[PDB]
Design a binder for this molecule. Structure first.
Ligand code: CLA
Ligand code: CLA
Ligand code: CLA
Ligand code: CLA
Ligand code: CLA
Ligand code: CLA
Ligand code: CLA
Ligand code: CLA
Ligand code: CLA
Ligand SMILES: CC1=C(/C=C/C(C)=C/C=C/C(C)=C/C=C/C=C(C)/C=C/C=C(C)/C=C/C2=C(C)CCCC2(C)C)C(C)(C)CCC1
Ligand code: SF4
Lengths: 75, 153, 733, 29, 80, 40, 141, 63
């Protein structure tokens, strides 16, 4: 059961990297673009959290290090 | 007006706040293409701010020397929409919830083990009870006269 | 008892270290000592009061002596707005040369401390001008302390011991205190003000050697015994009067001007003299109420017995209460503490808004220190009032002699009282915290116009009823054609209105949405503290979890792990819990006062008006902003005169953190650890030659709570005292 | 003059004498 | 030495005695209850005050009551 | 079937369903009627 | 019953520990628990570790009465062994403690007189003021 | 002797958990030497998770 939960968590991380991230722009300029893989909805004014992370993208800057691991893996 | 406050349609600090908010939003617009989705999203925020300030002007709110709306609670007949009407609506919803809870607690009291209907809820019984809160003021009043509201110990 | 303590044989036979700790902690609980009688109790208390008075006199004498010896009073009375008062000198061998240079302030020749108690202004206002005056005041106070000690010793002797019946003569003591201790003392004080202080403020120097030769008034007691008292009020001091000189000086001794003195920004001395004369008359009249020896007066017992409503809603009313109050010292102590705690807060609230001392109002650090000091004292006293009220219910309450009177009905509906207090506290906390968090979230999202800002309209209307015209309400004193304003139109309203509508003093400060939230926070704190204390007092005799609580005393650890667990079930534990809430409440009111005044003294009230509506404003613009100078008292580049407060800040932090150890960790862990240390000592060579005489044991369960609470309170007081003094003294407002 | 003599007395000597006396008192019997 | 007292609400199920860690309580003949036995505390000088008996008390309120009193080397559980 | 309906009537499951519905209702009301300080 | 005396019986096999007697046994008192075992067997010690109880008589010295009673109840519950223990003073005086009457205290027995028995309910204790300035407690009446 | 078995009784003992409450009489002891003969069962458990208690004849009121 714990392994299934961990696999679900990893699947969510990869899906958010694929669907809600600026990974492809960060690949071409990793020194000037901040990684981001979470975008909030425009409700009750919370849309201010989508900051300028660069690369023509607005979101929440992530500190998990997934972008560098994906670049190392060749993704 | 009241307590030395001025209406927000007249106060210049309110308009200055509105101008500065739009200017702050428009500075991030410079970093994106005029047709991009982030540019479309910041424009929606600009329209939302304009609508908010225009509404605050139209509703007739009072603003202090800081440009921010101030609420009037004492009971003034031209400020009932800030405390009195919302308070009445809250008191109608909360009494509804309390009365539905009380009726459900009374309905399961006379059973073999009534603690099992408090962790596993009898959903049909709750469905029966739930819509009795629409007339909760009438019933709450009526058990006050007869004496079925308060336990006399 | 053969050892210590000699008043407790049971403690004397304890073979552990606990015999010492407890012996110190129960010295003044005379009621629980071995072979104690009521006569001995009353006589010991009477003797202890004299020692307390002697200590009080010695402390004031020491303050006066040190101000006269090492202070700069004579140079300060010539420049009160530009000379820093000196408390005493500093002689510390641990000081370095930069510390010696940095602490040489005022006009001193060495390290000194700057006084923030306001004694200089108080003594200057009452007529003292030279160092010799302070020297001769200190000698008199030392003489008084010696006489108090002598009387305390005398009334302990066999032929001068007072009897219990004398201590229980309430009517005579009330008459003498109301008429003599209150009335005559006030008459003497207004005599001093008329004879010394008022002439002193107009350049006249009146002392013991010449006060029989100088007329306090030109007419000299003629108008008083004739009846035309108005001649004492005809010519007051002009508005261009300079304090201490004869420039613009009048001849009036008793006036009703109102407002403040233009130069000193304080109350007129003549108004103070008239106030004290009126209060002396009131107390002298009130002191003739009770029957003592002459066949006229009232009996308090009959007054209490006769006040029973005929409807029966109050039961037997106040019948029998005279005996319960008179035979219980805890009831009397609780009443006295409640009243004294109320009036300590009254003094705190009235001294900052209506300064009475010359050139105090523009000494910001002294004002802040005095307000915080008196409010914290009131907070502690008010907790004591409920603690002793709880002790009364256990030790002295007689249910049979109080059948169905107003005191038994409280125990009858304690549940209804406690539940309603709980509801009030829950409502206040829920809604105040919700509004604060809503405003914080709006400020975080960049939309400050979505805040919920409620105008404190009731208090603004009250201010306008006092004559404030900043809200445009036009009610009572703010109106021109009303009877209330017409009545005092030519007595005190001009000066009072001028002072009230002057927007740089502390008289009825302008309030906005930021004050509404903090006042409700204060109300929530008050309600929760009273909830804890009242629940502790009313459940002291027992409850459903412990029906026989009165059989175990006021302070016991617990009833054990049975019946689900009985941690903190005693009434002492309720007080222990309520001390934290009292500290939190007083911290809230002191934060409010300090932040509201520090912005007003800086010329920008708008900093408080906009930043007090959300809690991040409090964290950033009050705490973080004002700690820049304090934490820079010593740094890797040097030090300055603020280093003492920087050290005390961290000292208070350390003590506050140390208290958490006693409050979180409990006894068994420490006892099991002490056992190992005992073994280790018993097995160590060259240390077996040394043996302990008292067996080492861990602190008791109740002892640890007291120790942790003491550390918590000491850190709480010292940290805020250092922060307040340093922040108000780095910039002087 | 006086502080250089009085401070060591009140801060060191008097506490030591009082501690010694109190310890001898509490260790009696 | 702590004080241990027994009240006549006892039902004599002997639960306190077998919960004593220092053998303070015992059962004695009686006639006030169906079990014809009541608890007694003849050795309170060995009492430690852990109140284990009150945790085993079935009566409401408790029939065995422990009051913490003067402390001895036996009552504090000291082995040194 | 009966046992699963009994389980879905347990306190935590009913609580999460009820609060999810409430949160959705409030979120949609705020999406279509945003920035309400008063009641017109 | 006439209490049994204290012979010189052997002790369980044990390697020693730091949890044994201290100087309190030298100057105040210690306790001695004696039992009889049918076979050599392992038993946990109340001071830590495991010892070997011999077949026949067994004598063990401990620091507290609670340790002796804990070991005794463990013996009775697990090994079905009857036990006794005594209090020994520095001057060689031995005081027999348990089982006091020859019968375990949880079993009723004739000849025992109640001590500390109050012939009232716990709710009938008098208020503190009735015992104020007297040396008596409410539960002692 | 005592209230009939199965009746409903109000508790008058002040220190009891069910003071001023209502319970059901299970059995009543007939031995005159028994101090608290009335056995009462209650719907709610006390702080010790016990639902039964013995009361004297004057601490029980028939309701
Ligand atoms: C640990 C794993 C993890 C985490 C933390 C998240 C977190 C998130 N995902 Mg995500 N995701 C994951 C795994 C994860 N995901 C996986 C594995 C996939 C692949 C299938 C996806 C695919 C995915 C998509 C496609 C999207 C997200 C989105 C989101 C964001 C909004 C989610 C939301 O509002 O829920 C939606 C709300 C619910 C699901 C309701 C909760 C249901 C519970 C049981 C309560 C039910 C009560 C109900 C609501 C009331 C009505 C019931 C009815 C009977 C009346 C959020 C940051 C969204 C986003 O970022 O938008 C920008 C988005 O569009 N995720
Ligand atoms: C703090 C106590 C307090 C309380 C309980 C109230 C209570 C009330 N005020 Mg009120 N008020 C107060 C202080 C208070 N006021 C103060 C200090 C002011 C001065 C600004 C006002 C000024 C005020 C106005 C101007 C009006 C009220 C009105 C009302 C009533 C609300 C309308 C209603 O329910 O119809 C019943 C209500 C009885 C309204 C009303 O119609 O009252 C009859 C109204 O128009 N109040
Ligand atoms: C049937 C539900 C119900 C009802 C009618 C009441 C009624 C009352 N409570 Mg109360 N309470 C409840 C549930 C309820 N409570 C729950 C669940 C808790 C535990 C969190 C509490 C905790 C509580 C405290 C701590 C206090 C009260 C107090 C009070 C009284 C004053 C009102 C108040 O402060 O409300 C405040 C109410 C709350 C803080 C709790 C509300 C919890 C939710 C809203 C109720 C949900 C009920 C249920 C889940 C729905 C039934 C569904 C059914 C149809 C299947 C009032 C008699 C106060 C009192 O005695 O003073 C007179 C008081 O101090 N209550
Ligand atoms: C006229 C006669 C007279 C007088 C003057 C006193 C005076 C006193 N009696 Mg007393 N007594 C009397 C008759 C009298 N008694 C009689 C006839 C009896 C027998 C029936 C007693 C029985 C009696 C007992 C049993 C006790 C006393 C005690 C005391 C002392 C109270 C402590 C104290 O100093 O409070 C000072 C109080 C005031 C100055 C008044 C209150 C001031 C308010 C609270 C503050 C307001 C002032 C102002 C705003 C602050 C100043 C600011 C600035 C100057 C700092 C006080 C000295 C007690 C004591 O300590 O004895 C040693 C005590 O235990 N008396
Ligand atoms: C006129 C005021 C007054 C008087 C006459 C009394 C008198 C009494 N109180 Mg009382 N009390 C008062 C005010 C008063 N109290 C107040 C204001 C409070 C609330 C704080 C209390 C709270 C209180 C409790 C909770 C108890 C008493 C008790 C007692 C009785 C015994 C006191 C005792 O043993 O002292 C012993 C006192 C001490 C050993 C003091 C301990 C040291 C304290 C913590 C100060 C530490 C300061 C710290 C070291 C500073 C460090 C500085 C740093 C730089 C190092 C006695 C009748 C006790 C009693 O017997 O009640 C039945 C009891 O349990 N009182
Ligand atoms: C910051 C710390 C803190 C806070 C918030 C509280 C809060 C409270 N204390 Mg308290 N207390 C504290 C520290 C604190 N205490 C400390 C250090 C002590 C000393 C030991 C005490 C001692 C003490 C006593 C002795 C008493 C209280 C009481 C109370 C209550 C007073 C009523 C009230 O304010 O209602 C407002 C309630 C709150 C502010 C609670 C927070 C509610 C949250 C914000 C709402 C829920 C959020 C969200 C929906 C939950 C989701 C999280 C999770 C499900 C994922 C309240 C719950 C009294 C009491 O019980 O009265 C009822 C009481 O008798 N306290
Ligand atoms: C309770 C009142 C009180 C307090 C808190 C202090 C506090 C202090 N005094 Mg002090 N003093 C007092 C009354 C007091 N004094 C009185 C009444 C006298 C007149 C006899 C003096 C005479 C005095 C001298 C001569 C000196 C101090 C000094 C000091 C400081 C160092 C402590 C010391 O050496 O004590 C000394 C205490 C005494 C000599 C007597 C104590 C008073 C009673 C009678 C005991 C310290 C700030 C010293 C100083 O200024 O350091 C820089 C110093 O040299 N004091
Ligand atoms: C009011 C209290 C007080 C006072 C007056 C002093 C005074 C002093 N401390 Mg000190 N200290 C105190 C409290 C106090 N301490 C406390 C509470 C602590 C613990 C935090 C310390 C920790 C401390 C340390 C760690 C050090 C000092 C040092 C010093 C000395 C520094 C002066 C110097 O440089 O000459 C230096 C002069 C000498 C080394 C020669 C001293 C020779 C003396 C005068 C001989 C006389 C001793 C006498 C016979 C014994 C009398 C004991 C009494 C019980 C009768 C000075 C004598 C420093 C020092 O060197 O002192 C040893 C030092 O290193 N103190
Ligand atoms: C007791 C505290 C308290 C109070 C009084 C409010 C009150 C309010 N908040 Mg708020 N808030 C609070 C705590 C509180 N909040 C906390 C603790 C947080 C942090 C999580 C927030 C976070 C927050 C946000 C982020 C927002 C609000 C908003 C609002 C406003 C909502 C208006 C609305 O949607 O009406 C419409 C809703 C109704 C009419 C209710 C209808 C209910 C049923 C369906 C009616 C149907 C049956 C009849 C209102 C003034 C919103 C706003 O616009 O502020 C200006 C907003 O964006 N609040
Ligand atoms: C527990 C106890 C106790 C205690 C208690 C307490 C502690 C209490 C407190 C109390 C309190 C603390 C109270 C308070 C009060 C207050 C008040 C009562 C106030 C009043 C006021 C008024 C009445 C005013 C009015 C006015 C005027 C005159 C002027 C201005 C305007 C107005 C209108 C405001 C005792 C010991 C007894 C015993 C028993 C137990
Ligand atoms: S822990 Fe403290 S409170 Fe809890 S039971 Fe043991 S002693 Fe009583």
């Amino acid at each position: 059961g714990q392994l299934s939960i961990i696999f679900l968590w990893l699947s969510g991380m990869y899906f958010h990297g694929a669907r809600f991230s600026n990974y492809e722009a960060w690949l071409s300029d990793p020194t000037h673009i901040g990684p981001s893989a979470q975008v909030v909805w425009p409700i009750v004014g919370q849309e201010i959290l989508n900051g300028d992370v660069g690369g023509g993208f607005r979101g929440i800057q992530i500190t998990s290090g997934f972008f560098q691991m994906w670049r190392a893996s060749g993704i | 007006d009241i307590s030395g406050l001025t209406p927000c349609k007249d106060s210049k600090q309110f308009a200055k706040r509105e101008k500065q908010q739009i200017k702050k939003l428009e500075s991030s617009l410079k970093l994106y293409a005029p047709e991009s989705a982030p540019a479309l999203a910041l424009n929606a925020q600009i329209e939302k701010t304009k609508r908010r300030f225009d509404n605050y002007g139209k509703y007739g709110l009072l603003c202090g020397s800081d440009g921010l709306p101030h609420l009037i609670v004492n009971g003034d007949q031209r400020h009932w929409g800030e405390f009195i009407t919302p308070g009445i609506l809250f008191l109608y919803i909360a009494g509804w919830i309390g009365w539905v809870g009380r009726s459900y607690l009374i309905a399961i009291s006379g059973e073999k083990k009534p603690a099992m209907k408090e962790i596993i809820i009898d959903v049909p019984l709750a469905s029966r009870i739930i819509f009795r809160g629409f007339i909760w003021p009438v019933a709450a009043y009526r058990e006050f006269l007869n004496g079925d509201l308060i336990a006399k110990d | 008892a053969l050892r210590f303590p000699r008043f407790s044989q049971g403690l004397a036979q304890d073979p552990t270290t606990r015999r010492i700790w407890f012996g110190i902690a129960t010295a003044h609980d005379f009621e629980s000592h071995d072979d104690i009688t009521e006569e001995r109790l009353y006589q010991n208390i009477f003797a202890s009061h004299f020692g307390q008075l002697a200590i009080i006199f010695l402390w004031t004498s020491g303050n006066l002596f040190h101000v006269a010896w090492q202070g700069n009073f004579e140079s300060w009375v010539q420049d009160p707005l530009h000379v820093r008062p000196i408390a005493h000198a500093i002689w510390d061998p641990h000081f370095g040369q930069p510390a010696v240079e940095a602490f040489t302030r005022g006009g001193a020749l060495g390290p000194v401390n700057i006084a923030y108690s306001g004694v200089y202004q108080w003594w200057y206002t009452i007529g003292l001008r030279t160092n010799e005056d302070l020297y001769t005041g200190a000698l008199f106070l030392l003489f008084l302390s010696a006489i108090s000690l002598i009387a305390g010793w005398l009334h302990l002797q066999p032929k001068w011991k007072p009897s219990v019946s004398w201590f229980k003569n309430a009517e005579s003591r009330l008459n003498h205190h109301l008429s003599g201790l209150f009335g005559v003392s006030s008459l003497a004080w207004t005599g001093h003000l008329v004879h010394v202080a008022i002439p002193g403020s107009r350049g006249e120097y009146v002392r013991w050697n010449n006060f029989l030769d100088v007329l306090p008034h030109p007419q000299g007691l003629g108008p008083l015994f004739t009846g035309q008292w108005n001649l004492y009020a005809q010519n007051p001091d002009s508005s261009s009067h300079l304090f201490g000189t004869s420039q613009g000086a009048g001849t009036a001794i008793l006036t009703l001007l109102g407002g403040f003195h233009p130069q000193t920004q304080s109350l007129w001395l003549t108004d103070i003299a008239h106030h004290h004369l009126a209060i002396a008359f009131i107390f002298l009249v009130a002191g003739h109420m009770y029957r003592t020896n002459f066949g006229i007066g009232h009996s308090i017992k009959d007054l209490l017995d006769a006040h029973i409503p005929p409807g029966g809603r109050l039961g037997r009313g106040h019948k029998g209460l005279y005996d319960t109050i008179n035979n219980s010292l805890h009831f009397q102590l609780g009443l006295a503490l409640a009243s004294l705690g109320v009036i300590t807060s009254l003094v705190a609230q009235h001294m900052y808004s209506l300064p009475a001392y010359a050139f105090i109002a523009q000494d910001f650090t002294t004002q802040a220190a005095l307000y915080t000091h008196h409010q914290y004292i009131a907070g502690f006293i008010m907790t004591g009032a409920f603690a002793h009220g709880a002790i009364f219910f256990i030790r002295d309450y007689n249910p049979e002699q109080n059948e169905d009177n107003v005191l038994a009905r409280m125990l009858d509906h304690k549940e209804a009282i406690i539940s309603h207090l709980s509801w009030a506290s829950l409502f206040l906390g829920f809604h105040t915290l919700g509004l604060y968090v809503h405003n914080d979230v709006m400020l975080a999202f960049g939309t400050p116009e979505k805040q919920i800002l409620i105008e404190p309209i009731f208090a603004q209307w009250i201010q306008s009823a006092h004559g404030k015209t900043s809200y445009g309400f036009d009610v009572l004193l703010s109106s021109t054609s009303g009877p209330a304003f017409n009545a005092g139109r030519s007595i005190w309203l001009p000066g009072w209105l001028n002072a009230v509508n002057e927007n740089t003093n502390s008289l009825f400060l302008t309030i906005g949405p930021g004050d509404f939230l903090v006042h409700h926070a204060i109300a929530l704190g008050l309600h929760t503290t009273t909830l804890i204390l009242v629940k502790g007092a009313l459940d002291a005799r027992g409850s459903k979890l412990m029906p026989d609580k009165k059989d175990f005393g006021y302070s016991f650890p617990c009833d054990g792990p049975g019946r689900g667990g009985t941690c903190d079930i005693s009434a002492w534990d309720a007080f222990y819990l309520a001390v934290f809430w009292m500290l939190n409440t007083i911290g809230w009111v002191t934060f409010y006062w300090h932040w509201k005044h520090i912005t007003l003294w800086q010329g920008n009230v708008s900093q408080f008006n906009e930043s007090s509506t959300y809690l991040m404003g409090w964290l950033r613009d009050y705490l973080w902003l004002n700690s820049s100078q304090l934490i820079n008292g010593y740094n890797p580049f040097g030090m300055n005169s603020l280093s003492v407060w920087a050290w005390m800040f961290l000292f208070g932090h350390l003590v506050w953190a140390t208290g958490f150890m006693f409050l979180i960790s409990w006894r068994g862990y420490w006892q099991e650890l002490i056992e190992t240390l005992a073994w280790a000592h018993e097995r160590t060579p060259l240390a077996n030659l040394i043996r302990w005489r008292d067996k080492p044991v861990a602190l008791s369960i109740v002892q640890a709570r007291l120790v942790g609470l003491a550390h918590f309170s000491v850190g709480y007081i010292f940290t805020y005292a250092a922060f307040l003094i340093a922040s108000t003294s780095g910039k002087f407002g | 003059n006086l502080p250089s003599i009085f401070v060591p007395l009140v801060g060191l000597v008097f506490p030591a004498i009082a501690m010694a006396s109190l310890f001898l008192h509490v260790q009696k019997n | 030495s702590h004080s241990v007292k027994i009240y006549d609400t006892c039902i004599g199920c002997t639960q306190c005695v077998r919960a004593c860690p220092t053998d303070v309580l015992e059962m004695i003949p009686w006639d006030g209850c169906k079990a014809k036995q009541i608890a007694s505390a003849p050795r309170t000088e060995d009492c430690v005050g852990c109140k284990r008996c009150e945790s085993a008390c079935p009566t409401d309120f408790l029939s065995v009551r422990v009051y913490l009193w003067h402390e001895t080397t036996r009552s504090m559980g000291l082995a040194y | 079937m009966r046992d699963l309906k009994t389980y879905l009537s347990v306190a935590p499951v009913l609580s999460t369903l009820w609060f999810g519905a409430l949160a959705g209702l409030l979120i949609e009301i705020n999406r279509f009627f945003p920035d309400a300080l008063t009641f017109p | 019953t006439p209490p049994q005396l204290d012979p010189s019986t052997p002790s369980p096999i044990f390697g020693g520990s730091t949890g044994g007697l201290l100087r309190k046994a030298q100057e105040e008192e210690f306790y001695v628990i004696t039992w009889e075992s049918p076979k050599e067997q392992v038993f946990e010690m109340p001071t830590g570790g495991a010892a070997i109880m011999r077949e026949g008589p067994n004598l063990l010295k401990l620091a507290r009465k609670e340790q002796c009673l804990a070991l005794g109840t463990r013996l009775r519950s697990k090994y079905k062994i009857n036990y006794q223990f005594y209090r020994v003073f520095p001057n060689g005086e031995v005081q027999y403690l348990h089982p006091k009457d020859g019968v375990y205290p949880e079993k009723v027995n004739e000849g025992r007189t109640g001590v500390g028995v109050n012939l009232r309910s716990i709710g009938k204790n008098v208020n503190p003021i009735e015992v104020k300035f007297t040396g008596k407690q409410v539960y002692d009446l | 002797v005592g209230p009939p078995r199965g009746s409903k009784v109000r508790i008058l003992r002040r220190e009891s958990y069910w003071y001023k409450g209502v319970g059901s009489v299970v059995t009543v002891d007939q031995d005159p030497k028994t101090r608290y003969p009335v056995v009462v069962r209650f719907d709610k458990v006390n702080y010790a998770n016990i639902s039964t208690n013995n009361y004297a004849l004057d601490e029980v009121e028939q309701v």
